[PDB]
Amino acid sequence: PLGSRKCEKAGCTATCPVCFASASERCAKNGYTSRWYHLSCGEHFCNECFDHYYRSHKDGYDKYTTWKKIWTSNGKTEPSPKAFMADQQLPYWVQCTKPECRKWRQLTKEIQLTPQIAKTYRCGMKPNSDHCSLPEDLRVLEVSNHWWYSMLILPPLLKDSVAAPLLSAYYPDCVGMSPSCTGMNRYFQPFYQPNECGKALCVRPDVMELDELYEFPEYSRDPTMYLALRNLILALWYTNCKEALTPQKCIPHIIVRGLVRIRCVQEVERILYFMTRKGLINTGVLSVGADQYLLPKDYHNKSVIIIGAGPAGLAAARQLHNFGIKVTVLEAKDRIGGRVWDDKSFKGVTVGRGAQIVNGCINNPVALMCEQLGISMHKFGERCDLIQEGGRITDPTIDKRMDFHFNALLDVVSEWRKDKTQLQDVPLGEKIEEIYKAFIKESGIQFSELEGQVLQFHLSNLEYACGSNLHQVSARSWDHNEFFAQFAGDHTLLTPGYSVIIEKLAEGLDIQLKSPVQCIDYSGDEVQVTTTDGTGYSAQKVLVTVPLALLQKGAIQFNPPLSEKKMKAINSLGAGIIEKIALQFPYRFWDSKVQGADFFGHVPPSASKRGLFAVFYDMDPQKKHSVLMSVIAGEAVASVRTLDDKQVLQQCMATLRELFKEQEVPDPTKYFVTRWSTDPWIQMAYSFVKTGGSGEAYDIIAEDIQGTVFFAGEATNRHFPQTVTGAYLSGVREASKIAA
């Protein structure tokens, strides 16, 4: 009767507190003590065990001080006795893995929980009967109660998290890991480093993102538990991206003392499903069987028609199929891929007629997919000599000088734009030419004919990037996407081709080729989708991923029609265009002059030849086979429209013979010339912002109609326009919206 049997904590539901520490010879056990300390509704320790560590004259004080020091030196939270108890003394809980038992059990205080123990535990297991039949401790079912966590004192801190090696620059308790704790693909950098500049597809490990706050508002007050589990989940995905990450896989990696572990295990499942739906994990070319769908059955009860089987359409279809949702894709052409189309008949080389370069590999879904497929990319060398007609290699200082001036011209454009509205937008090309003449006139510096020709090369590089002569592109908005964090790291040639990724995304999906959509009717209960031959399809939801030019032409009839606001956005973007030529030779004639560089430039003879085979690419990085690819950009696409393939070839060969004037150039034995501009279902290479337009147009086009008609494709990605990467992510984006 001297002492208490009531917990210190007001509102606590523990009618009988027992001490979990039994660290002091004087432990009150289950009897009366001065004060019962409350870690949770089911966990308390007595006053003398408190004192055993807390007071200097007691034997557990030595342990407390050494822990307090470590906690203090690499931690941010207070090193209180409750914190010491929760980190070092609270006994572990583990769930029996027998499918028909599944009961939670407390381990004896000396046992250190490990992943292997958690993986295989069953009732009764010890390092040295009828154990499953014994009743489950009553405090377990209590953890489910809404209030349980609120009555828990300190947030859990994870031990030996798979995330820890990646977060060594953070204080562990800011990322939900314990301060007392002591060959991943180099393109996987999912976590921001402290005060590192923006990069694409990166999370702060210590801050919840907007969508995370939105889905789990209960964590806005204290995100520790969420952050620890989200970071763990991401770290697990990236350590093995070739298989689906499941709750069962995560649970053995959640290591924390106490009943709170139960709360953690109960939460990791919801967090995992969220990250799956959003496309952060369980993604890329991962494919899962009917018995292994990535989201629970409550997401499964819907049907989707996806129009177009390019990167965007296939990404969405792959995501939704993997989730367990019913998906049908309708593709106009006799092949899947869209602006991914590879030619594999070149001896020992894959040459893309469309996409083949990866711009920024760090965190790039394409790099993730290369890892999953076990394929290699080739990082481009820096060297690109500018070769003149006929033969002269341009002085690198001239190259660098004119590049500097071209960028200076762009810099003053970004000054001029600061006080202009869309109604005041001028062509970038017009504005450059104007500023150039103003600079030429003011300081009377005359550039040589060559310097002028090299400026022209640099100009053609920007026309190349935009897919247009710069007189059609917005001075205000040309580089709008740079406002957002962009993909860091290597620029690579995807040697095996994007087709390898496309084929994997598509495998096992329901895809209807040669089924060009002509009508989408969303006025009724289900969407009615009609092909050009009158074939009928229906689903609850429809995703449109057709190219921008095809929306601009109105090739698909929408009932009800698209809004004026959408039409204005659609028409405010440009349908950019480049074409490619590929040439196979009997031998590598360029080796003597090019000396293993990945590419060489071609200085335009005059303004009228700008963009006409500006850059040639050596298509075998192993330097064995002889294939060159070149590009036709800007005004040069026009000059080529009325030429047949033989004639384009002639001009290319004439160019090469001028570039390598001092030597013989063999005849090509195989070639292609692309005609994307006149491919009826494509009609372009990639989007750009036309004069008067805004980057916002990408968002407006991306906006769903009545949660019923959805839009994806490169021209719907404001952060990452133009690219296979951006198209892929737009598909992942829409799959998330659709699955919600």
């Binding site: 597809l201 969508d211 496309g279 964090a485 952060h719 919206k737």
Partner: peptide, 12 residues
């Protein structure tokens, strides 16, 4: 600032 945020977790 949108110069930083994760594209897939900034959709709301």
């Amino acid at each position: 600032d949108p110069h930083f945020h994760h594209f897939l977790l900034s959709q709301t």
